[PDB]
């Protein structure tokens, strides 16, 4: 037929070429990712010193899960594990184009296949010389903290003792009622209640002869962007690029999250101690220990706690 | 019923249109509409509002002369009233009597 037809990467490939293309595409991922492993030796942009009021870039990480953790005081803290995975700087804007006072950096993590993606996204990455990433996000960065595109970022970018903010899409609950969506009391089970147990009561008053905008009603619950503020970093695993963040993080396991320094008033200028542009392992000024801990943390393999 | 009633509102709406267009044309030469209409009458010119609009749109040079004429008659009026007593009447304030 002289009409539109559908195609996908595998339609015309033979049995042998099916394996060959798979190995080739994975081969390219290897070479491209090892080209960018050395930022400081590839014309790094000038590195300005830290000044008060600076905001540096953040990372995109995958949610591994939760585990228990203890402090030297014996308290148990439930902690979430975030893995920084194929995180690169992707695009830079200046203050003018972003229209904010501050500039913008777009980061991206969790490389994905190239086979079911629009041509537009693939061209964007081919210019940058990176395999495609699962998600983009935007970070507000001051001019001193700008980092050149194509620069990888690592869990060591964060250090134990700093507080952080995580934003991710919450678990979806589908279309829900009014009791489970907004915690409405509902109506009694017995004593004459007829076909009204979990229903909303009166919508509004009789006078206004309408329903106010923003009235809470049954609808689709979850799958929204939410942020958690002021989560402490208890430990960083440099070998696997794992960050231990106090408490709960929005989203399901294997959900990508946005990690950046906390914007709460208390920790206004705490990034003085942290690597200001970012943590460069290519610099190799000093080789980090595999596990970084916060001082209060009780490390395993230590003597059992005796509150003498 | 609407067609019959619009027949009489048509004549008042066109007069509103003519006045708006006349005010536009006179303000170009610096005259408010009341002054232009009144002082033209005092010169014994009986052009109506429909005809005045045609002059403004299609005869800009002739309309400009009328504005000067109406301004001159207005200027004469101020002098005549401002100077109390017997002062010779303005050249353009002369009224041609009929019998």
């Amino acid at each position: 037929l002289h009409s539109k037809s559908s195609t996908w990467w595998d339609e015309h490939l033979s049995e042998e070429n099916l394996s060959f293309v798979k190995q080739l595409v994975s081969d390219e991922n290897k070479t491209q990712l090892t080209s960018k492993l050395n930022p400081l030796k590839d014309e790094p942009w000038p590195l300005h010193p830290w000044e008060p009021g600076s905001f540096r870039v953040g990372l995109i990480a995958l949610k591994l899960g939760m585990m228990p953790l203890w402090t030297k005081d014996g308290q148990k803290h439930a902690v979430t594990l975030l893995q920084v995975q194929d995180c690169h700087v992707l695009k830079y804007t200046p203050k003018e184009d972003h229209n904010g006072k501050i500039a913008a950096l777009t980061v991206g993590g969790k490389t994905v296949s190239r086979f079911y993606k629009p041509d537009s996204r693939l061209e964007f990455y081919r210019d940058l010389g990176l395999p495609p990433k699962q998600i983009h996000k935007i970070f507000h960065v001051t001019d001193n903290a700008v980092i050149k595109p194509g620069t990888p970022l690592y869990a060591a970018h964060f250090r134990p003792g700093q507080y952080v903010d995580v934003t991710a899409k919450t678990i979806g609950k589908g279309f829900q009622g009014v009791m489970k969506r907004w915690g409405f009391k509902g109506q009694p089970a017995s004593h004459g209640q007829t076909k009204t147990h979990r229903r909303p009561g009166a919508i509004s008053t009789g006078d206004i002869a309408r329903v106010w905008p923003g009235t809470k009603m049954p609808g689709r619950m979850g799958n929204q962007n939410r942020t958690v503020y002021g989560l402490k970093v208890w430990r960083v695993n440099t070998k696997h690029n794992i960050i231990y963040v106090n408490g709960s993080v929005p989203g399901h396991k294997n959900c990508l999250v946005k990690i950046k320094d906390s914007t709460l008033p208390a920790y206004k200028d705490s990034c003085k101690n942290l690597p200001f542009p970012t943590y460069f392992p290519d610099g190799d000024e000093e080789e980090l220990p595999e596990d970084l801990f916060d001082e209060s943390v009780w490390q395993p393999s230590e003597p059992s706690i005796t509150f003498a | 019923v609407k067609c019959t009633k619009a027949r009489r509102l048509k004549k008042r709406n066109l007069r509103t249109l003519w006045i708006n267009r006349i005010t536009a044309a006179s303000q170009e030469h610096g005259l408010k509409y009341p002054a232009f209409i009144v002082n033209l009458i005092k010169c014994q010119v009986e052009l109506n509002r429909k005809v005045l609009v045609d002059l403004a749109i299609y005869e800009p040079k002739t309309f400009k002369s009328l504005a000067a004429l109406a301004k001159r008659r207005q200027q004469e009026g101020f002098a005549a009233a401002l100077g109390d007593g017997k002062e010779p009447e303005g050249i353009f304030s002369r009224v041609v009597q009929y019998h």
Partner: protein, 108 residues
């Protein structure tokens, strides 16, 4: 709750001719190379499959005649042979189903 007003054809014509309610055109229709009949890309050909099942029913008919009753399933492998074919050494000790027709070209 009952309608307060009759709904006009102009209102109704917008509802039932909206694109959300129209039949979507299909891009996954293709031809079978062997028979030249139409098929969808991800589903088997309904004409070539029809050939196989009609032959399968014939074979299953013959199996029933050999068994002669319920609960007579063999404990050994089965094989189907067509006129002009004889069991090989590997075919020894396996139930043999015999078909009058010649070996079909597709069947191997």
């Amino acid at each position: 709750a009952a309608p307060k007003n009759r709904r006009t054809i102009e209102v109704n014509r917008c509802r039932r001719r909206n694109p959300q309610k129209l039949i979507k055109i299909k891009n996954n229709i293709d031809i079978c190379p062997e028979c030249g009949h139409l098929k969808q890309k991800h589903v088997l050909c309904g004409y070539c499959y029809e050939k196989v099942r009609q032959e399968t029913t014939k074979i299953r008919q013959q199996i029933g005649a050999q068994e002669g009753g319920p609960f007579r399933a063999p404990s050994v492998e089965t094989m189907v042979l067509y006129t002009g074919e004889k069991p090989s050494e590997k075919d020894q000790g396996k139930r043999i189903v015999e078909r009058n027709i010649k070996r079909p070209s597709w069947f191997t």
